[PDB]
Design a protein around this ligand. Structure first.
Ligand SMILES: N[C@@H](CCC(=O)N[C@@H](CS)C(=O)NCC(=O)O)C(=O)O
Ligand SMILES: N[C@@H](CCC(=O)N[C@@H](CS)C(=O)NCC(=O)O)C(=O)O
Ligand SMILES: [Cl-]
Ligand SMILES: [Cl-]
Lengths: 233, 224
């Protein structure tokens, strides 16, 4: 259950566990939850009410952002990209970043190329749910997706890092999962390799294990856009 | 310390095996950053300076929007921009490692980099304001606040440098903008942060920093 204003601090993180502060429908914390699951890392999730944060939560992140990792040695790591990197370096089995220093750098370059998508998807959602104009937002999103489509087509690989799923794919995934519920799946209608990638991601055991419940997510968005505080409980 | 390539210049040839190329500009702090790392790790490299106000047409095959810095390898690979380049260099080349080996300490340096993220733009805005004779009290106050965040870290850690008792990657990633405070006329923005002033001195005493340290009158002359 999500903690908010009035909730007591959780205790220290047990030895042999790492803690993630998250929220069930936040795509940034979804990144880091995929990495935790993909690496079979033993963890606990503490969900936070973003509209009505616990006052102690500002001791985990100064502006109360999520995600934050908290270790059994009381160390704090944030936000999502830095957390995912730490996890891959700190935990041994299944390495998600590639071995080649160049390929590692290329995945980080791809991540920069993706930097407008999160805000564009969110603005599209808000535009469609308020009845505001969305022609420009969708054209913009389609252009960002064409930039990704060119990479996949040029490489002739299913995934962004190659034939097998890797760190970059998990870093991009949360926003693609959301296209359906956001009502913007039409924004990949011009990008066939990207549509193949979505399907490949859905078949990934980690992705599949973390897929949101569509109906509950729609219910969250319905109360969120009515400005209801209960949306975050 | 060599001439800059502009519009109508010829494309450079392939980077020879055993060298790496950096596309830079002599007074660009983002490129300065990457040049510091090249030098600190004793990496054999060539610096190719680009005319940012009149870019070579070919340079857009190195970066789609003609940004610097860019690294170009003997394998024809392109790596950009400054932070990704710095990390690539530290991982791809052996010898002196600038990031800590420890995953947490390494992540912490990246967190410090993020805390610094407003400083580059604020320093530039302060320069532009002071040079054009425009308002700057609020820009300076904002810069002092970011510098207070950095002061707090050094004071809490009680170490000379941001990564501990010796210089490491994080210090080199921050340095370019601090070198520039003097010439920018905003040294007064560290008058309240004593650990930060000590750090400025520690940095100037570092051999790599000192080797790349701009001549004040030359830099003054550029900014005209
Ligand atoms: N750049 C950060 C962004 C994280 C972020 O903006 N998370 C959202 C939740 S999805 C947040 O902390 N928002 C809280 C708020 O707006 O009050 C990252 O990559 O993790
Ligand atoms: N985010 C990049 C920024 C690089 C950058 O903005 N460099 C400046 C020169 S110091 C530049 O390319 N400006 C010229 C332009 O915008 O075309 C980095 O971290 O290196
Ligand atoms: Cl699908
Ligand atoms: Cl000094």
């Amino acid at each position: 259950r999500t903690l908010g204003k009035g909730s007591q601090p959780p205790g220290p993180v047990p030895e042999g566990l790492i803690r993630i502060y998250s929220m069930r429908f936040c795509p940034y914390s979804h990144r880091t939850r995929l990495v935790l699951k993909a690496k079979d890392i033993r963890h606990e999730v503490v969900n936070i009410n973003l509209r009505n944060k616990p006052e102690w939560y500002y001791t985990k992140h100064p502006f109360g952002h999520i995600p934050v990792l908290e270790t059994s040695q009381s160390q704090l790591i944030y936000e999502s990209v830095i957390a995912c990197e730490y996890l891959d370096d700190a935990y041994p089995g299944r390495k998600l970043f590639p071995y080649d220093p160049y390929e590692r750098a290329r995945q980080k370059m791809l991540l920069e190329l993706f930097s407008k998508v999160p805000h564009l998807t969110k603005e599209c959602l808000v535009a469609l749910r308020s009845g505001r104009e969305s022609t420009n937002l969708k054209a913009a999103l389609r252009q960002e997706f064409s930039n990704l489509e060119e990479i996949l087509e040029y490489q002739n690989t299913t995934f962004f890092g190659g034939t097998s799923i890797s760190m970059i794919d998990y870093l991009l995934w949360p926003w693609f999962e959301r296209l359906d519920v956001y009502g913007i799946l039409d924004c990949v209608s011009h990008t066939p390799a990207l549509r193949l990638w979505i399907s490949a991601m859905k078949w990934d055991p980690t992705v599949s294990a973390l897929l949101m419940d569509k109906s509950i997510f729609q219910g969250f968005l319905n109360l969120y856009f009515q400005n209801n505080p209960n949306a975050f409980d």
